[PDB]
Design a protein that fits this description.
The complex is a heterohexamer, with three copies of chain A and three copies of chain B. By secondary structure, chain A is α+β, with helices and mostly antiparallel strands. Chain A has a single domain, classed as Hemagglutinin Ectodomain, Chain B (Alpha-Beta Complex). In chain A, 53% of the residues lie in helices and 13% in strands. Chain B has two domains: 100 residues, Ribbon (Hemagglutinin, Chain A, domain 2), CATH 2.10.77; 216 residues, Alpha-Beta Complex (Hemagglutinin (Ha1 Chain), Chain: A, domain 1). The longest helix of chain B has 9 residues. In chain B, strand 2 and strand 3 form a beta hairpin. Classes of the chains: A alpha+beta, B mainly beta. Chains in contact: A-B, A-C, A-D, A-E, A-F, B-C, B-D, B-E, B-F, C-D, C-E, C-F, D-E, D-F, E-F. At the A-B interface, strand 1, helix 1, strand 3, helix 2 and strand 5 of A face strand 1, helix 2, strand 23, strand 28 and strand 29 of B. Strand 1 of chain E pairs antiparallel with strand 1 of chain F. The structure holds a molecule of 4 linked components (GAL-NAG-GAL-SIA), a molecule of 4 linked components (NAG-NAG-BMA-FUC) (3 copies), a molecule of 3 linked components (NAG-NAG-BMA) (3 copies), 2-acetamido-2-deoxy-beta-D-glucopyranose (3 copies) and calcium ion (3 copies). A molecule of 3 linked components (NAG-NAG-BMA) binds next to loops of chain E. The PDB classes it as viral protein. Keywords: receptor specificity, viral protein. The assembly is hexameric.
Chain lengths: 167, 316, 316, 167, 316, 167
C-alpha cells in the first residue's frame, strides 16, 4: 500500500518537498530530504529575485486627464501607449507561461535526480517496482533505512545476501 | 522491505498556465500583476505642494488662488480638477508644453524685470481678480491709456537675463469685447504688440469681438510665453492691449507632477502615482492604470497572471 | 523474442527553426504569419457607408458629391482616393484631426443654427458647386454685400449648444483673387472675422492674392472648425469674407473608418482591414500591411515562421 | 532487423505517434500506444490554443494614405511604427524558435517516458539492446506481447525462466 | 578495471545569469551588449559631405558658409555644432521638418525660377553676409524700393514646376527694426506678402519692432518653405519686405544625415553612427547611445549581458 | 581516485568537452569523445548564428542634439524612446537568461546521452559506481577500453566471464 512519485504526490509530507517513505518490519515511516528540497527552493527563489524587479526608469505625464490635449497628438499618444500595452501584455503572459513550464519541469527533475541517486546507492541490492520505489532484497531496519537517506548505505555489506535473494 | 521516493502535495492547489496547459495545478503560486491600489497620494520623504484651487500655470501669472505659490518649491507637485490658471478669462497658448516644463521644474524663483512707465495708467484691474476689491494678476500689469479714449504712447521695454539658467517669460494680450472698448482703454488706431528676442520675433494683434460672458465678462486675456536664454534680451514694443510682466521665473531644480482627486498622505512612502492614488508594489506588472507615472510596474491588460512557486500538485 | 519502442516519421517532413538549429525537420508544422489577403472589404454585420466621390470632411460642409451623406450613420466608413471634401477650391485647416474625429463618430446628426440676416445677400454661389446650375455648400452660406462694391454691415450672430454632446462647428473664410474682387463682394475697407466662444477666441483675415486657377477659379474658401461644449455659445463677428454655417453637427456614436481601393462585400465577415482588403486570420502575426486597422494580427517583417506541431522527423 | 527509437523513426507507424514493434515466433507486428500519443497531441493542442489567440485591441488610422500628414508628425509616427515592428518581429521569431525547441524536446520526452515504463514492467526479465528495444529472455507470444502493451504483464510469471536464461 | 565519463572544466570560469541563478560559472561566455565605440565617422563606400560651418538649411538659401554646397550630392551628410543656416539674422519656420527632408534627400539640384523685375532695386545687401564686401544669400534677392522712402510697386511673380518631382520652394520675410526703417526700404503704407499655390495660400506680414542686435543688427529675415508639386504653380504677391527666391531645389535621391563632433574617416566602414562616432558590431544590443542612427544594435540600459557559450564549470 | 561527471568536471580534459577516463592494469588514460563534443558545439554555434543577427532596419533622427525641438513633441519622442528602451532592455535580459539556462541544460543533456550510450554498450558486464563510472567486471586492456570509446565493444565476448564475476 506504499507508493512513490510515479503514482502521485504525498499530502502527508509537510517537512519538505521531497522525501522517503519506507516499509519494513518496524513499520512505515516518512522523512524529508533536506538537500533536494533546498535545491528546488533556491532555484524558485532565484526566479522570484529576478522577476520581482523594479524598473529604475521614471516616466512623466504627456497627457492631461483634466484638460484634453490637441486631438492629433492625443491620438498619436494613445496609439503609442496602446501598442506598448500590447507588447507588455504579451511579454507578461509569455513570461509566466514559460517560467511556469520551467518551474514544473525543474521540480520534476529534482525528483528524478534523487531517485537516480538512491538507485545508484542500492546498486545490485534492490529492484525498481515501477511506482518510484525500490524493493530491497535484504532485511533493512530503521538504521539501514536511515543510512539510505543520509547517503551512507554501503551496498557491499548486503550484496551477498541480496543477490542470493534475487534468485 | 522497501523504500519509496516521493514529493509533497496539498489539497489547496492553485491553477496556473504553462506553455502547454491552461490550469495545471501547482502547490503554490504568487500573483505577478498588481491590482491593489492605495487611494491616497503617498508623499513621505518628498516636499509636496497640493495646488488646490491654483492651476499650475497660475503660479507664473499669479491670480488670487495662486498667491501662496508664486515662488513654490516642491519635489512632488499635485494638480487638482478644481484648479484654474486664470482669474480674468482666457488661457495660455501652448499650455501643455508649459505645463510639462513646470511639472518637472522643482518649483520657481521669481525675479523682477525692472520695467517702469510714464504717460500711462498701470493700475488696470478687474472684479474677476478679487483681492481687497478689484485687482489683477500679481505678476503682471494691465497697461492702459492715461485716460479714457486717450492715445496710448508707443513704448519699448527690454529685459536681459543675467542668470545662468533660462528664464520663463510670460506676457498677455488683451482681447476686448468691441473696438469701442479697445478704444476706451488704449485709444483709437490699430494696436500691435511686437515681442523680440535673438531667437524669436512674433507679432500679436488684439482681436476684439463679441463673445460669451465668462464670469459676466466678455474680455479675454490670453497668455504667451518663451524661454529667454542666459545673456539674451527680450524686447516688447506696443501701443496697447498689452499685459506686461512684472517678474520672470527660473526653474528651481527637479520635480515630478501628477494630477489627482485623492488626499495627500505624508505617512506612507510611494514612487508610482495615478489620479486615484498610489501603487505600492514590487510586482513587475499592474492592471490599475495605464497612465500611472513615476517609477512603476508596467501596465498590462490582464487582471491576473499567477507565477508558480511550487511543483505540480498531484494529490491522491 | 523482443519488443521495441518507436515513434512515427514521414517522408514529407517540414523544416522549422529552433533555439539551436535552422531547418530541423519535423513531422508537421503550421504557419504563424498570415500572408493571405482577401481583396474586398468584408462588411457583413456592419452598417457600411462607401463614401465614393464624397470626402469625409465634405459630409460636414456638403458639397454636391456629399448630398447623400449630410446626416449619415455608419459602423464602418470607407474613404476613397477619388473623394473630395470640396467643390469650391480650398481645404480644411487641421484637416487630419477632424478626419480622425469623423472616422470614429458613428456618423453625424445636423441641427440648424438659427442664423438669419438683413441688409445683405445670402445667395453667394459658384459654378464650381454645380447642382441645378450654380450653387454652393449645402450647410453653409456665402454672405455678400447687398450689391457690388457696397458696404458690408458689421454683424454678429451667436449660437448656443443645447444638447448634451459637443457640437462640431465649421466656418470658412473667403480668400479673394484680388483686393478689387474682395471689394466687389464685401465692399472696401479691411475685413476681419472674429470667432469667440468661452474657450476659444481667434481672428481670421482674408488674404486676397493671385494664385493658380483650380477648376478655373483662383478663389479659395478655407474651412476652420471647433468643438463647442454643452451649454457653450459661439459668436461670429464679421464684415465680409465669411462663409457662415447653417447647421452644426453632433457625432452619433461609434464607428471605424478606413481608406481603400477595393469593392465592398457584405457577404464575408471581417474585423481587420487595410487599403487592399481584409485580413481574415486567427494567426497571431501578419506580413500583409503594417498600417492594417481594426482588430488585427501583429504586423511582422518576416514572410514565414513555421511552428512545429509534431516531433522531430527521423526517417530511415 | 527490428529497431527502436534510438536509431530512427518508423514510417510504417500511421495509427499513432508512438508505438510498439515486436518480433516473436509468430512474426513481426506494430501497434500504436494511444495514451502517450494523446498526451503529446494534447500538449501541442495546448500550444496552439495559446498561440492562435486574437488581440481584442482595436487600432485606428493615425496616418493618411491619400493625403500625407505633416512631415514632422509623420516622421515620428513612422519611427514609432517601425520600432514597434522590430519588437514584434523579434518576439515572433523568438516565440516560434523557443516553442519549437520545446515541442521537439517534449515529444522526445514522451518517448523516453514510455520506454522507461516498459523497462520497469519487464523488471529482470529483459535487457536493453541499445536501439530502443528489449531482448526478452522468455517465450513471449502475441498475448504476452499484448500484455506488455496494455500494462498487464506480470513479471513474476516469467521471472524464474527469464533469470535462468540470462545465464 | 573501470571507465568514467566526464566533461571538461577550467580554472578561468566566467559568471553568467540564468532563469534560476545569478552568477553560475560556465566554461566560456561572450558579450552580447556592445560598449566599444570608434570615435570617428566611418564613411568608406559613401559619398560624404562634412558640412562644417554650413548649416544644412543654408544649402537652400546660400549664405557664404554654404557656397560649396548649393548643389551638393551625398549618401551621408554630416552636420556640425558650428554650422549656421544663416548670415543675416533669422531662422527657418518649420525648421526641423525641413531638416529631416534634407537629411534623406541625397542632396539637392537647383533650378532657376526665372523672376525678373522692374521699378525696384534688387541688390539689397548686408555686412552680415560678407563676400567681397557686403552681399546677400546666394539663392535669394532682397527686393527694395527704387530709392529711400519711395513706394514699392505692388507685384506678382509666379513659377511653375515642370519636373516630375516636388520642388522645395523657399522665401523670406524681412522684419525691420522700426516702421521708420521699413519705410526707408519699402515705402510707407502697410506691407503684405501673399503666397499662393493650388494647395496653399497664406499671408505674411512684416512685424517691425525693436529687438536685440545679433551681429550688430536688429533686423531678422525669417524663412518659410513649401513643397510645390509636379505641374503646380506658386504665386507671390507683395509690396515689400519680401526676400525672393532666385532658385528652387529638387531632392536628388537617398541619403542619411547625422550630427557629430568627431573626424570623418574614409578608411573604416560603418552603418551605425551617433554624435561620438561609429558603432561597429554584430552584437544584437548596445549601451553606447540611445539616439544612434543607421542600421544599429538595439540600445539597452545594461552595460553587460554575457551569453554562455560553454557548459557549467564544475572544477574540483 | 578516478571519478566521473556526477562529482565534477575535469580540468585535464583539453581536447574536447566530453571524454572518457579509464583505469586498468596499464594505468590511467583520458580521451575526448569527438561526436558528443561536436554535437554540443554545433548547437551553441547555432545559438550564436541566430543571436549575432543584424537588423536590416534603418532608423533616422527625429530629434536634434544641437537645436532642441519643440517641447511637446520632444517629450512625446522621449517617452516613446524610453518605452522602447525598457522593452528592449527586458527582452535582452530575458534572452540571455533563458538561452543560458538552455545552454547549460543542453550540455548536461549531452553528457547524459553519452553515459547512457556506454551503459547500454556494456550491458550486463559492468555496474554503475554512482560517480559517473562503470566498474567493469572483466579484464579490460587498452584495446578493450578503446573499443568502448569507439562503439565497437561486443558485450557477448566478455559476458560469461563478467556475469560470473558479479557473483
Ligand atoms: C473674363 C471673365 O468673364 N471672367 C469670369 C470667369 O470666366 C469664366 C466664365 O465666364 C466661364 O463661362 O466659366 C468659367 C468657369 O470655369 C470661368 O470662370 O468666371 C469667374 C468666376 O466667377 C463666379 C463663379 O464662381 O462661378 C460667379 C459667382 O457668382 C461668383 N460668386 C460670388 C459673387 O459670390 C464667383 C466669385 O466672384 C469668385 O468665386 C470669388 O473669388 O465667381 C468670374 O468671376 C469672372 O469675372 C471677372 O471677375 C474678376 C474678379 O476676379 C473681375 O471682377 C472681372 O472684371 C470679371 O470679368
Ligand atoms: C495552502 O495552505 C497553507 C495553509 O493554509 C492555512 O491553514 C488553515 C488554518 C486554513 O484554514 C487557512 O486559513 C490557512 O491559510 C498556506 O500557508 C499559510 O498561509 C497563511 C495565509 O497567508 C499564513 O497565515 C498567517 O496569518 C497571520 C495573520 O493572522 C499573518 O500575520 C502571517 O504572517 C501569515 O500570513 C500561514 O502562515 C500559512 N501557514 C502555514 C502552516 O504555512 C499556503 O500559502 C496555501 N497555498 C496558497 C497558494 O496560498
Ligand atoms: C504530410 O502528408 C499527409 C498526407 O499527404 C497526402 O497524401 C497524398 C494523397 C498526397 O498526394 C498529398 O496530396 C496529400 O496531402 C498530409 O495530410 C493530408 O492533408 C490533406 C491536404 O491538406 C488533407 O486534406 C483534407 O481533406 C479534404 C478531402 O478532399 C480536403 O478537401 C480538405 O481541404 C482537407 O484539407 C488530408 O485530410 C490529409 N490526409 C491524411 C491521410 O491525413 C499532411 O498534412 C502532410 N503534412 C505536412 C506538414 O505537410
Ligand atoms: C580561458 O582561458 C583560455 C586560455 O588563456 C590563455 O592562456 C594563458 C597564457 C593565460 O595567461 C591567458 O593570457 C591566455 O589568454 C582562453 O583561450 C585563449 O584566448 C586567447 C585570448 O583571446 C587567445 O589569444 C590569441 O591572441 C592573438 C593576439 O596576439 C590573436 O590574434 C588570436 O586570434 C587569439 O585571440 C588564444 O587563442 C586562446 N588560447 C587557446 C589555447 O585556445 C579562453 O578564451 C578563456 N576563456 C574566456 C571566457 O575568455
Ligand atoms: C508560497 O509562495 C509565496 C510567494 O512566493 C511565499 O511567500 C513569499 O515567501 C518569501 C520567503 O519567505 C518572502 O520573502 C520575504 O520578503 C522579505 C525579504 O526577504 C522579508 O521581509 C521576509 O522575511 C521574507 O524573507 C516573500 O516576500 C513572500 N511573498 C509574498 C508575495 O507573500 C510562501 O513562502 C510560499 N508558501 C509556502 C507554504 O511555502
Ligand atoms: C498538422 O497540423 C495541423 C495544424 O496544427 C493540423 O490541422 C489542424 O487540426 C486541428 C484539429 O486537429 C484543427 O482544429 C479545428 O478547428 C476548426 C475551426 O476552428 C474546426 O472546424 C475543426 O473541427 C477542428 O477542431 C485546426 O484548425 C487545423 N489547423 C489548420 C491550420 O488546418 C493537423 O491535424 C496536422 N496534421 C496531421 C496529419 O496530424
Ligand atoms: C569562447 O567562445 C567564443 C564564442 O563566442 C569563441 O570566440 C568565437 O569563436 C568563433 C569560432 O571560431 C568565431 O567565429 C569566427 O567568425 C569570424 C567572422 O565571422 C571568422 O572570420 C572566424 O574564422 C570564425 O569562424 C567568433 O568570431 C568568435 N567570437 C568572438 C566574440 O571572439 C571562442 O573561441 C571560445 N573559446 C574557446 C577556448 O573555445
Ligand atoms: C485617448 O485616451 C483616453 C483614455 O485614456 C480617452 O479618454 C481619449 O478620448 C482618447 N482620445 C481619442 C481621440 O480617442
Ligand atoms: C512614412 O511611411 C510611408 C509608408 O509607410 C511612406 O510612404 C512615407 O514616405 C513616410 N513618411 C516620411 C515623412 O518619410
Ligand atoms: C529629451 O531627452 C534628452 C536626452 O536624450 C534630454 O537632454 C532632453 O532635455 C529631453 N527633453 C525634455 C523636454 O525633457
Ligand atoms: Ca526671488
Ligand atoms: Ca437632424
Ligand atoms: Ca542645376
Amino acid at each position: 500500500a506504499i507508493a512513490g512519485f510515479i503514482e502521485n504526490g504525498w499530502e502527508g509530507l509537510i517537512d519538505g518537498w521531497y522525501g522517503f517513505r519506507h516499509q519494513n518490519a518496524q513499520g512505515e515511516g516518512t522523512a524529508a530530504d533536506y538537500k533536494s528540497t533546498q535545491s528546488a527552493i533556491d532555484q524558485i527563489t532565484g526566479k522570484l529575485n529576478r522577476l520581482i524587479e523594479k524598473t529604475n526608469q521614471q516616466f512623466e505625464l504627456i497627457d492631461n486627464e483634466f484638460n484634453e490635449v490637441e486631438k492629433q497628438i492625443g491620438n498619436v499618444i494613445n496609439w503609442t501607449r496602446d501598442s506598448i500595452t500590447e507588447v507588455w501584455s504579451y511579454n507578461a503572459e509569455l513570461l509566466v507561461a514559460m517560467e511556469n513550464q520551467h518551474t514544473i519541469d525543474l521540480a520534476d527533475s529534482e525528483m528524478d535526480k534523487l531517485y537516480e541517486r538512491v538507485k545508484r546507492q542500492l546498486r545490485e541490492n534492490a529492484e525498481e517496482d515501477g511506482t518510484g520505489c525500490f524493493e530491497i532484497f535484504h532485511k533493512c531496519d530503521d538504521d539501514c533505512m536511515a543510512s539510505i537517506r543520509n547517503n551512507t548505505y554501503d551496498h557491499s555489506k548486503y550484496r551477498e545476501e541480496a543477490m542470493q535473494n534475487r534468485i | 522491505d522497501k523504500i519509496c521516493l516521493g514529493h509533497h502535495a496539498v489539497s489547496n492547489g492553485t491553477k496556473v498556465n504553462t506553455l502547454t496547459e491552461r490550469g495545471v495545478e501547482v502547490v503554490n503560486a504568487t500573483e505577478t500583476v498588481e491590482r491593489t491600489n492605495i487611494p491616497r497620494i503617498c508623499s513621505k520623504g518628498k516636499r509636496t505642494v497640493d495646488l488646490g484651487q491654483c492651476g499650475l500655470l497660475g503660479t507664473i501669472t499669479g491670480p488670487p488662488q495662486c498667491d501662496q505659490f508664486l515662488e513654490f518649491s516642491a519635489d512632488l507637485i499635485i494638480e487638482r480638477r478644481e484648479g484654474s490658471d486664470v482669474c480674468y478669462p482666457g488661457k495660455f497658448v501652448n499650455e501643455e508644453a508649459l505645463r510639462q516644463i513646470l511639472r518637472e521644474s522643482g518649483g520657481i524663483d521669481k525675479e523682477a524685470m525692472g520695467f517702469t512707465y510714464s504717460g500711462i495708467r498701470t493700475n488696470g484691474a478687474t472684479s474677476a481678480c478679487r483681492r481687497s476689491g478689484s485687482s489683477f494678476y500679481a505678476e503682471m500689469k494691465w497697461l492702459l491709456s492715461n485716460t479714457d479714449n486717450a492715445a496710448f504712447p508707443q513704448m519699448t521695454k527690454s529685459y536681459k537675463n543675467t542668470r545662468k539658467s533660462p528664464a520663463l517669460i510670460v506676457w498677455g494680450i488683451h482681447h476686448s469685447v468691441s473696438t469701442a472698448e479697445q478704444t476706451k482703454l488704449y485709444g483709437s488706431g490699430n494696436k500691435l504688440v511686437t515681442v523680440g528676442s535673438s531667437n524669436y520675433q512674433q507679432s500679436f494683434v488684439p482681436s476684439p469681438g463679441a463673445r460669451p460672458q465668462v464670469n459676466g465678462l466678455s474680455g479675454r486675456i490670453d497668455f504667451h510665453w518663451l524661454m529667454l536664454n542666459p545673456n539674451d534680451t527680450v524686447t516688447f514694443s506696443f501701443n496697447g492691449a498689452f499685459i506686461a510682466p512684472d517678474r520672470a521665473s527660473f526653474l528651481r531644480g527637479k520635480s515630478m507632477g501628477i494630477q489627482s482627486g485623492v488626499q495627500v498622505d505624508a505617512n506612507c512612502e510611494g514612487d508610482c502615482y495615478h489620479s486615484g492614488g498610489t501603487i505600492i508594489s514590487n510586482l513587475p506588472f499592474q492592471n490599475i492604470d495605464s497612465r500611472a507615472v513615476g517609477k512603476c510596474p508596467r501596465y498590462v491588460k490582464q487582471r491576473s497572471l499567477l507565477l508558480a512557486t511550487g511543483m505540480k500538485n498531484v494529490p491522491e
